[PDB]
Amino acid sequence: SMSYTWTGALITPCAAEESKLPINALSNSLLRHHNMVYATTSRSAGLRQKKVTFDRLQVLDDHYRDVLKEMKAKASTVKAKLLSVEEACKLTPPHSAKSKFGYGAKDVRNLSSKAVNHIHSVWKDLLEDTVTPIDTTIMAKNEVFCVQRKPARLIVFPDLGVRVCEKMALYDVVSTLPQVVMGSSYGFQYSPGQRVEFLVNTWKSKKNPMGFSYDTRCFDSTVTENDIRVEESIYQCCDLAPEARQAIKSLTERLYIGGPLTNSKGQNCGYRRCRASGVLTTSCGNTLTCYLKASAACRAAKLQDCTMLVNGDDLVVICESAGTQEDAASLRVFTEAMTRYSAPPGDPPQPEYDLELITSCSSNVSVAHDASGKRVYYLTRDPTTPLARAAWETARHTPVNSWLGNIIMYAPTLWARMILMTHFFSILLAQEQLEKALDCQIYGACYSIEPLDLPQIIERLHGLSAFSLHSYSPGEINRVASCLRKLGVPPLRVWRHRARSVRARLLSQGGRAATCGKYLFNWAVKTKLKLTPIPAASQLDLSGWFVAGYSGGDIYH
Numbered sequence: 001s002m003s004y005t006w007t008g009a010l011i012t013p014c015a016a017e018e019s020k021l022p023i024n025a026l027s028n029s030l031l032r033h034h035n036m037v038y039a040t041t042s043r044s045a046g047l048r049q050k051k052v053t054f055d056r057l058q059v060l061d062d063h064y065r066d067v068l069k070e071m072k073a074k075a076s077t078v079k080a081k082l083l084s085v086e087e088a089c090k091l092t093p094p095h096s097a098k099s100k101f102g103y104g105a106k107d108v109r110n111l112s113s114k115a116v117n118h119i120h121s122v123w124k125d126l127l128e129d130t131v132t133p134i135d136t137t138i139m140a141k142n143e144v145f146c147v148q149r150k151p152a153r154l155i156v157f158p159d160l161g162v163r164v165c166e167k168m169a170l171y172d173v174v175s176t177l178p179q180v181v182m183g184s185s186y187g188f189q190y191s192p193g194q195r196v197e198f199l200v201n202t203w204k205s206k207k208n209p210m211g212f213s214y215d216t217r218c219f220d221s222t223v224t225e226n227d228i229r230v231e232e233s234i235y236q237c238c239d240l241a242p243e244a245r246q247a248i249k250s251l252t253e254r255l256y257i258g259g260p261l262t263n264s265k266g267q268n269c270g271y272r273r274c275r276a277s278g279v280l281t282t283s284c285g286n287t288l289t290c291y292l293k294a295s296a297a298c299r300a301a302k303l304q305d306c307t308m309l310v311n312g313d314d315l316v317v318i319c320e321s322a323g324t325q326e327d328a329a330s331l332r333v334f335t336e337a338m339t340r341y342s343a344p345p346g347d348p349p350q351p352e353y354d355l356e357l358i359t360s361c362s363s364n365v366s367v368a369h370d371a372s373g374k375r376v377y378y379l380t381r382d383p384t385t386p387l388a389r390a391a392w393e394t395a396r397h398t399p400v401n402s403w404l405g406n407i408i409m410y411a412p413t414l415w416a417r418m419i420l421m422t423h424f425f426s427i428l429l430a431q432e433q434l435e436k437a438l439d440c441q442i443y444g445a446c447y448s449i450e451p452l453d454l455p456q457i458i459e460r461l462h463g464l465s466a467f468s469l470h471s472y473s474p475g476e477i478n479r480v481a482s483c484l485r486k487l488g489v490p491p492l493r494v495w496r497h498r499a500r501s502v503r504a505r506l507l508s509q510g511g512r513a514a515t516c517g518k519y520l521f522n523w524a525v526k527t528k529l530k531l532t533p534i535p536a537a538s539q540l541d542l543s544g545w546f547v548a549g550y551s552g553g554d555i556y557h
């Protein structure tokens with residue numbers, strides 16, 4: 001069937017939208033070529049609508065149903081609880097979309113009478129009605145990129161009251177079941193340091209390793225009613241409370257398999273018969289369905305010793321090579337199986353033979369050397385987009401600061417350290433907002449971080465290595481230098497002078513600020529410190545961090 005049907009009505013913005021890079025006094029110090037940077041807006045939503053709209057066909061063979069059986073047995077060992085209205089309420093981001101029924105996220109966060117009353121009524125309605133499609137809002141995502149100029153991505157989400165209800169019914173399921181179903185292949189359990197460790201160990205565990213990523217053409221749109229009904233029969237495998245089973249059935253019939261689409265004005269835009277991007281189960285479903293299709297497609301293409309690594313739609317496979325030309329041939333069969341399963345590719349998969357040449361979760365493995373000369377494997381990426389987004393957030397305050405999320409996840413990298421750390425810690429010194437908590441997104445969940453806890457966080461997710469890394473790979477050094485050339489970013493020399501200034505200004509503050517300069521910027525000095533393990537790092541409660549993915553799922557910690 002068609003993934004979408006369209007009435008003709010436009011996808012409208014909520015507030016004001018800027019497509020070109022905003023400029024302040026601090027912009028040029030980071031980036032010179034400003035017309036290379038742009039953000040997607042609801043202006044381009046019509047191109048995306050075309051790209052997401054297509055007929056899906058599905059052919060389900062025995063390999064599909066074999067893998068599904070296996071998944072179901074594992075899923076049936078799961079016991080999940082109903083979350084109380086209040087517990088579910090506290091998982092709402094403070095900046096999450098307001099209800100059409102006269103309340104907002106903070107009303108939900110403080111547990112106001114109006115909101116909780118309404119949520120209980122939506123829950124009741126979920127139990128007593130398993131048929132009526134639930135209204136969703138269709139919105140274009142505003143996201144910053146550097147030119148090659150992409151269209152806006154879409155977001156489809158239900159009302160805040162329904163979102164809290166999904167939480168009551170399914171928060172426990174989406175958090176625990178995926179790791180139980182897919183084990184080592186569930187990506188969202190790993191921190192950066194564990195992701196590199198798992199990748200490298202897998203690679204070397206093969207006699208002759210072959211790795212590939214699979215770019216699916218718009219995953220969400222390819223998800224069918226079959227896939228959504230199938231993933232529900234997976235959730236139902238869990239030992240659930242009778243109310244949960246009804247709510248999961250109900251949310252599946254009425255909301256997950258599809259429903260009517262409404263712009264931010266309140267106008268009917270059409271109908272969805274594919275994955276909604278902004279529901280609680282978006283990350284988990286995508287991870288389940290992708291694992292399913294891909295698992296079976298490996299069997300169809302007779303790939304041997306497959307270790308898959310799934311994070312939603314994003315998939316990477318490491319296997320035993322059959323030889324370059326047979327690896328190529330096997331991937332053509334894998335693609336054929338995936339296409340048959342309604343997961344056709346965008347750019348076709350290619351077989352790779354250097355771990356560093358494989359991009360998974362927008363990242364590649366790479367090698368650097370710590371203080372003692374030890375080979376340290378770390379994850380990195382082309383820094384273009386993070387730096388473009390950092391240029392936008394230099395001039396426009398955003399609910400989720402993507403630079404901080406980057407500094408957290410890419411802390412051991414050359415570009416995060418010498419540019420991202422230096423620039424924003426300078427920004428925060430100038431504003432005196434170092435003790436001010438900032439929000440970022442890790443695995444889809446929104447986290448509230450205080451900048452001064454960064455060395456403690458970095459030690460915990462990467463090890464003390466992340467502060468000592470030098471002698472980066474020439475390929476990595478080039479790629480960074482190539483990106484900085486393109487963007488018009490100052491050279492390494494400039495950033496060293498700024499970091500020396502940042503560090504010295506942090507040292508004067510004493511305490512957590514001094515600890516910041518010491519650890520984050522020891523790279524910028526000639527007479528470097530030997531960095532000790534920070535004692536106040538075992539203190540940190542990093543629970544919720546690497547448990548599951550929640551992209552579009554409207555989750556807060």
Ligand SMILES: CC(C)[C@H]1C(O)=C(C2=NS(=O)(=O)c3ccccc32)C(=O)N1Cc1ccccc1
Nearest residue numbers: 192311312314361379405409441442443444551
């Ligand atoms: C952007 C940063 C914060 C982080 C992330 O949240 C994601 C990430 N967030 S997400 O839940 O939207 C998602 C879905 C699928 C695949 C990845 C992701 C990611 O890829 N990251 C990059 C990354 C770096 C090192 C190790 C693993 C991932």
